[PDB]
Structure 1
Amino acid sequence: FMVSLPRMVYPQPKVLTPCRKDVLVVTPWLAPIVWEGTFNIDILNEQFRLQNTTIGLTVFAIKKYVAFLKLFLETAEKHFMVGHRVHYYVFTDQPAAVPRVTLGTGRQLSVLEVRAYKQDVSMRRMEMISCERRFLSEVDYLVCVDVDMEFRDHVGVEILTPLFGTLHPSFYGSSREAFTYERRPQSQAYIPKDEGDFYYMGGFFGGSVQEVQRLTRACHQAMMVDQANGIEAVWHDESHLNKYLLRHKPTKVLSPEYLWDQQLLGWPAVLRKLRFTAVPKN
């Protein structure tokens, strides 16, 4: 049950003025595409706080990638769901290498030890995410991200929805035939040249716990099939995520504001904010 919003004073939305005219702000299946200027964060904050929403954030830091956790977590503290309940889940082969990061109130961190693999590290995240009962008991939404990243600006409840993917920053202006989907029919991830909505980035997806369990289960089952058949998708888990989201349309799509690489792509005018960005690495 959702109680009433309180009185709020904010600018009237005007139907005969769009804020954003430069970009597509809704998918053809009526999912919002989240850009700056499309949301009033005060209204969304009220809505989600009235539900006491808890957001879980998963991150893998295996082998040398433990080095990325300090900046990841410190900047998450500045920018990620501030004001909301947050539970970080750090999956690592080196529990003792997890930095001691000071958290704001209502935020917690759990360290989950996993085995290190010798592509497989990236690909095994789906299996490892699909800690199932734990998440259902502890959080409302799961957000699943790469560790070699930093938050530079607001990443908040505007992302939350049953199922979301993020537009890959190298492909948002590309035609579908250019997308690097898996193109071999022998793979479970196969997508023909005349199919596809978007090319989603494997490093930032999420949703409700139920929908995230569904996705990671389906992608892990599809990768197992490929394994059995002696085929490895061109972009590993990302290929499978793309096949899933083609057949199960996300209920929001995040703009490239939410997964950017300023060294490789600069700062185009279409991006008002650079919210979550790649950290330079070998």
Structure 2
Amino acid sequence: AIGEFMVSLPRMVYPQPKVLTPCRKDVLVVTPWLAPIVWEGTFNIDILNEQFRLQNTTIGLTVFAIKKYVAFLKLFLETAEKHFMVGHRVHYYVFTDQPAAVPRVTLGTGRQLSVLEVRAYKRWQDVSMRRMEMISDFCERRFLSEVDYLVCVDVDMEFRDHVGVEILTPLFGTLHPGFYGSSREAFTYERRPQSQAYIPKDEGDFYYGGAFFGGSVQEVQRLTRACHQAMMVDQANGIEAVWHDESHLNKYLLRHKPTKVLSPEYLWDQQLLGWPAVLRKLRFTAVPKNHQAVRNP
């Protein structure tokens, strides 16, 4: 459940926080709207685990595995078992056009998997974009009754290190690995004024990755609903945003500030971008793929 009130912790022994020592001297750890930016070194996971366990927190994890992308599920789920929310209640939701192709994966106690059969769109752009509509629909159909928080990710990925309750908050986005160090004019926002996802060169906080966002079920429902509606308006106007659902996610989070922002520890591609010193851990990373081959028959 999401408790309405602060919870009471038992006695705990851990190092005292140091007021006169910054937890990181190399990165921004809070946004100008006072949302934590989650980097290793900023959180004590034992405290957070207590707070969230005391509320019997249940986390849904949504993933789409349409057409050839069912091949990514085995490694995705096996690594999630090792690294994602261990110790907490987890409900995986695998959206797929091929229920029988979902691999058998042994789950830890308190963890379960639902397969949600959905239609496959022809264009990969549509498959990716229609995730917003499908997530929104199932929030009403299933998620509101079943989980407290939703975490919505790409399937062509693997967990390599801890991804836990430190990310949970009403609404979160994740710094895109290609742009965390970029100025807002280099951000690949949709720049056509006619698009609902339009963002001018003098606006923008961060470039958030479409591959990892989430929040309470109610906030994720609103975000996904609003993004879908924006895409439908664009469609009616003959427009498709440069980066599809990610463009609309960025517009949404520009205007509705997330209450936490995850660092690129949470969304990385090691082959493409290496391992900068600023990343103490690589938690959730790309799996090599041949885009053209895997996206088409």
Using structure 2 for the length normalisation, give the TM-score: 0.94
| Deviation sequence 1:229-266 (CA, Å, 0-9, x none) | 00000000000000000000000000000000000000
1:133 deviates by 3.6
Separation in 1, partners of 2:168, 2:222? 16
Aligned 8 A contact 2:7 2:51 in 1: no
1:4 deviates by 1.3
| Deviation sequence 1:13-50 (CA, Å, 0-9, x none) | 01000121000000000000000000000000000000
Are residues 1:154 and 2:158 paired? no
Separation in 2, partners of 1:167, 1:70? 26
Separation in 2, partners of 1:238, 1:3? 35
| Deviation sequence 1:169-200 (CA, Å, 0-9, x none) | 00000000000000000100000000000000
1:3 deviates by 3.8
Q: Secondary structure at the match of 2:247?
A: helix
Separation in 1, partners of 2:253, 2:20? 32
Q: Secondary structure at the match of 2:69?
A: helix
Aligned 8 A contact 1:127 1:220 in 2: yes
Aligned match of 1:84 in 79, 85, 88?
Answer: 88
Q: Secondary structure at the match of 2:281?
A: coil
Percentage identity across paired residues of the two chains: 99
Aligned 8 A contact 2:38 2:262 in 1: yes
Separation in 2, partners of 1:3, 1:184? 47
Separation in 2, partners of 1:233, 1:141? 28
Separation in 2, partners of 1:3, 1:24? 28
Aligned 8 A contact 1:2 1:50 in 2: no
1:132 deviates by 1.8
Once the two structures are overlaid, the 10-residue window that deviates more, 129-138 or 74-83, is: 129-138
Q: Secondary structure at the match of 1:178?
A: coil
Q: Secondary structure at the match of 2:121?
A: coil
Structure 1: 5+ residue stretches without partners: none
Q: Secondary structure at the match of 1:165?
A: strand
> Aligned-residue CA RMSD in angstroms?
0.6
Structure 2: 5+ residue stretches without partners: 290-297
1:2 deviates by 4.3
Equivalent residue number for residue 135 of structure 2: 129
Q: Secondary structure at the match of 1:142?
A: strand
Separation in 1, partners of 2:257, 2:6? 26
Q: Secondary structure at the match of 1:177?
A: coil
1:98 deviates by 0.2
Aligned 8 A contact 2:63 2:153 in 1: yes
Aligned 8 A contact 1:142 1:208 in 2: yes
1:164 deviates by 0.2
Aligned 8 A contact 1:126 1:219 in 2: yes
1:52 deviates by 0.2
Separation in 2, partners of 1:3, 1:202? 32
Separation in 2, partners of 1:214, 1:3? 27
Aligned 8 A contact 1:151 1:275 in 2: yes
